[PDB]
């Protein structure tokens, strides 16, 4: 299985540097070019640069937008790729993706990681408060209030309740995010069975569960 996993992201203050990493597995890393691409929230994909394979002497190229400010390197001993980002600004906030690449003839060799979110902000890390929203079908929910940075991962019954879930995009106000998640279940399910929302916030190392109880 070809796999690419980005790390090193999260919240960073404006002004300095950050170096993202991409661990690769499942293919002969040195035979392939590797690219980085970013996507600001609600914006288009932006190619940043690449590093070529061993046949092409691992040479680099960059987009005109970041040439001279971001660089790319690879650790062929660890089959890993890096993106060094300098003089960060708020507007470098984005999801950063690592992608296996090659000559254009071999476009179909493409493979992308799931990405990692980088937030460039002066605001500080804050875990969420999680509050139950208790009322043929019935709708329950969980209010996830006052956290920073994105993201959180919201699940219902540890992930084993996924249908009928609407987890809304968070809204930023006064340096804090809030969202709610609803789940609509048969009335036969609840309250006879337990329904619990689970909220993970990696930035603050916090994982919280809230059972929904009638009231």
């Amino acid at each position: 299985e070809v796999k690419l996993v980005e790390s090193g992201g999260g919240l960073v203050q404006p002004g300095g540097s950050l170096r993202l990493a991409c661990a690769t597995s499942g293919f002969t890393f040195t035979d392939y070019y590797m690219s980085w691409v970013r996507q600001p929230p609600g914006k288009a994909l932006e190619w940043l640069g690449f590093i070529r394979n061993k046949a092409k002497g691992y040479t680099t190229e960059y987009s005109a937008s970041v040439k001279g400010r971001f660089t790319i390197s690879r650790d062929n001993s660890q089959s890993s790729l890096y993106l060094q980002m300098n003089t960060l600004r708020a507007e470098d906030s984005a999801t950063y993706y690592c992608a296996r690449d090659h000559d254009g003839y071999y476009e179909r060799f493409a493979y992308w990681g799931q990405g990692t979110l980088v937030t460039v902000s002066a605001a500080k890390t804050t875990p969420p408060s999680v509050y139950p929203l208790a009322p043929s079908m019935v709708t329950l929910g969980c209010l996830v209030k006052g956290y920073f940075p994105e993201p959180v991962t919201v699940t219902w019954n540890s992930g084993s309740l996924s249908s009928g879930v609407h987890t809304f995009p968070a809204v930023l106000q006064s340096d804090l995010y809030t969202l709610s998640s609803s789940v609509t279940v048969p009335s036969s399910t609840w309250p006879s069975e337990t329904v619990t929302c689970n909220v993970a916030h990696p930035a603050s190392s916090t994982k919280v569960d809230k059972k929904i109880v009638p009231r």
């Binding site: 288009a44 994909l45 190619w47």
Partner: protein, 219 residues
Amino acid sequence: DIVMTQSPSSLAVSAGEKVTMNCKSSQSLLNSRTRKNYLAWYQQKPGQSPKLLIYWASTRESGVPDRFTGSGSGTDFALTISSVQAEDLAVYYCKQSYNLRTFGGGTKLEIKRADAAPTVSIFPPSSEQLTSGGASVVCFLNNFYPKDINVKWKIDGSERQNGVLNSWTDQDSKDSTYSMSSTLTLTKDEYERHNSYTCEATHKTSTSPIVKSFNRNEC
């Protein structure tokens, strides 16, 4: 660098219908050594990584449904979906890899469907949040279309127009509906001032609003 432009930037298309979207390059993408155009089309579904649909302008990647066709050469290209399906909701990108790489700005495919009124649910501030000092009143509007909607909060007969934030899920890839949260944020002080809270959705399917309410005194 090579500049890529896509049009239209968004479109709404109903299921079963045809969509064509176009992509232009600032210079030819035709590799004279291999006689392929280094132009690809990617699909990015909401919250997912982009996936390759088409390479060499017109060649489908293995497994791609053949409702997806690409054509073109040189500086003009197009991607057609012959009969759109609900699950084709996505942003579609063209990408050149002739010299460096450049993505177009995308074409966001929204699915048009029949107008559908929402199912409304209201939740008063939980006792747990009330103990902390704050009060958020939450209303959910489930499974409706189109996206924009006249949602109003009424508190003891007057409209409350400040302190309301609304958020939408991505269109459902099965039924193509939206859902939306409306969150009214109040100090506890102000929450405790008033008694009747109503979430009201006026949707184009009816001149009568869809209302859900509670009375604080009844809690």
